[PDB]
Amino acid sequence: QGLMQFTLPVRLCKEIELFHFDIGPFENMWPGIFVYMVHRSCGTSCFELEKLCRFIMSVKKNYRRVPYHNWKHAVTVAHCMYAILQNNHTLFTDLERKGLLIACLCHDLDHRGFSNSYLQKFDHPLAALYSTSTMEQHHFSQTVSILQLEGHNIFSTLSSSEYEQVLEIIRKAIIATDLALYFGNRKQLEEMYQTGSLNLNNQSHRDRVIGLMMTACDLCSVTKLWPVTKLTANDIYAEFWAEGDEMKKLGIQPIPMMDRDKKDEVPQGQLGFYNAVAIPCYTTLTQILPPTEPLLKACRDNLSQWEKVIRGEE
Ligand SMILES: Cn1ncc(Cl)c1C(=O)Nc1ccc2[nH]c(-c3ccccc3)nc2c1
Ligand SMILES: [Mg+2]
Ligand SMILES: [Zn+2]
């Protein structure tokens, strides 16, 4: 280091601050974009550059060449967290700023492009090792494995205490990306917010709020400009339909979401998702963290675009 300030071209330097930033098709710039965000979000002091670069490159190696749950998704989800953190400067601890960008980079480590359900119906060994949040416990395990590689301990300077705290932020953050857990998390947050019992000094409350941030960052394709949203959907369905193909091979009719034969019903499926998951997610997030409102606004814009698709206005 340490007078070594990572800098991006002007258009990226400016647009990376915005919630709707797309990290672009130049895979080789994504490590630099991540380090830039860590340095601005956390400090040039939070990580040893050499260790951080080595960690980033081993995380990249441990993402697979799948249409959606790939390295680009990792860095995309990390950027959304970067935007939340930068818009809510004073709300987050030093350990949280460290832990959360890392959790986001690692949250789908070694994803195979298949749901927890598919692993369970296939009878994958991972489903016997982890009976709930199957892939998410795997992703946390892969994160700890990489932190334990030689020269990969980016947390080396933390005390025993702080190290256990940050790994517990990461573990909870990664488990929260199981969408099965999102519905109850958000219900409890919505009740807490409205009865005025929400207390960011209650650790168990902070945990829930970080869970919702994780869901929000994880679903952030719905908060992009429409051409990004639309082309990301294609990747999402490429996995869903491959999974449905695999369900048919086990002798199981897949849900329509995963049946490529029901392609025609995608636009209506997007409406349900926006209405049942996406919009409620960003709404409750905006209630808790008012400066995240652009995510809700962008989501609503994309809802309105899917409604136009149905009306054949596109
Ligand atoms: C955008 N996004 N981000 C993260 C995630 Cl999970 C997504 C997503 O697409 N979710 C989603 C959720 C439910 C759906 N149902 C259908 C569908 C239903 C009947 C027929 C054809 C399709 N498509 C769906 C797509
Ligand atoms: Mg995941
Ligand atoms: Zn993800």
Q: Residue 61 corresponds to which tokens in the numbers above?
A: 């190696």
Annotated binding-site residue? 165: no
Give one DSSP letter per residue of 168-214, joined into a string.
Answer: HHHHHHHHHT-HHHHHHHHHHHHHHHHTT---TTSHHHHHHHHHHHH
**Other CB atoms closer than 10 Å to residue 191's CB: what's the count?**
11
Ligand 1 pocket: which of 218, 237, 257, 305 to mutate (most atoms <8 Å of CB)? Answer: 257
What residues are labeled active site? 69
For domain 29-311, give its CATH number from 2.30.30.240, 1.10.3720.10, 1.10.1300.10, 3.40.50.300.
1.10.1300.10
DSSP annotation string for 260-296: GGGGGGHHHHHHHHIIIIIHHHHHHHHHHSGGGHHHH
Which residue's alpha carbon is at the smallest distance from atom 3 of ligand 1? 219
Structure determined via: X-ray
Determine the Cα–Cα distance for residues 192 and 300; give it in Å rounded to an integer: 24
Long-range contacts of 145-150 (CB under 8 A, 24+ apart): 146/55, 146/58, 146/59, 146/62, 146/106, 146/109, 147/55, 149/54, 149/58
Q: CB–CB of 37/56 below 8 Å?
A: no
Q: Which of 233, 281, 275 is nearest to 257 (CA)?
A: 233
Per the document, the length of the chain is: 314
Tokens coding 280: 């409620």
**Closest alpha carbon to 208 in 177, 176, 162, 171:** 176
CA nearest neighbour of 138 among 153, 128, 126: 126
Backbone angles phi, psi at 189, to 5 degrees: -65, -40
CA 216 to chain centre: 7
| Residues 6 or more apart in contact with residue 158 via CB below 8 angstroms | 95, 166
Name residues whose C-beta falls within 8 Å of residue 43's C-beta, 6 or more positions apart in sequence: none
Q: In terms of Cα–Cα distance, which of 98, 83, 88, 107 is closest to 22?
A: 83
Q: What residue spans define the domains of the chain?
A: 29-311
Task: Give yes or no for residue 38 CB within 6 A of ligand 1.
Answer: no
Mutate to test the pocket of ligand 1, among 270, 274, 295, 303 (most ligand atoms within 8 A of CB): 270
Residue 138 CA to ligand 2 centre (angstroms): 10
- What is the distance between the alpha carbons of residues 18 and 186, in angstroms, rounded to a whole number? 24
Question: Ligand 2 is a single-atom ion; what residues have CB below 5 A from it?
Answer: 108, 177
Give residues with Cβ within 8 angstroms of 276, minimum separation 6.
Answer: none
Ligand 1 pocket, 219 CB below 6 A? yes
Q: If we measure between CA atoms, which residue out of 54, 41, 56 comes closest to residue 150? A: 54
Q: How far apart are CA 145 and CA 143, in angstroms?
A: 5
Residues near 230 by beta carbon (within 8 Å), at least 6 away in sequence: 305
What's the angle, vertex CA 290, arms to CA 31 and CA 304, rounded to 5? 80
259 is in an annotated binding site: no
The residue behind tokens 């945990």 is: 207
Distances (CA, A) of 190 to 87, 110, 269, 283: 21, 33, 25, 9
The alpha carbon of 55 and the centre of ligand 3 are apart by a number of angstroms equal to: 19
228 Cα to the center of ligand 2, angstroms: 20
Helices (H), the chain: 10-15, 30-41, 49-61, 71-86, 94-106, 116-122, 125-129, 134-147, 160-176, 179-194, 203-218, 226-249, 266-273, 279-288, 293-310
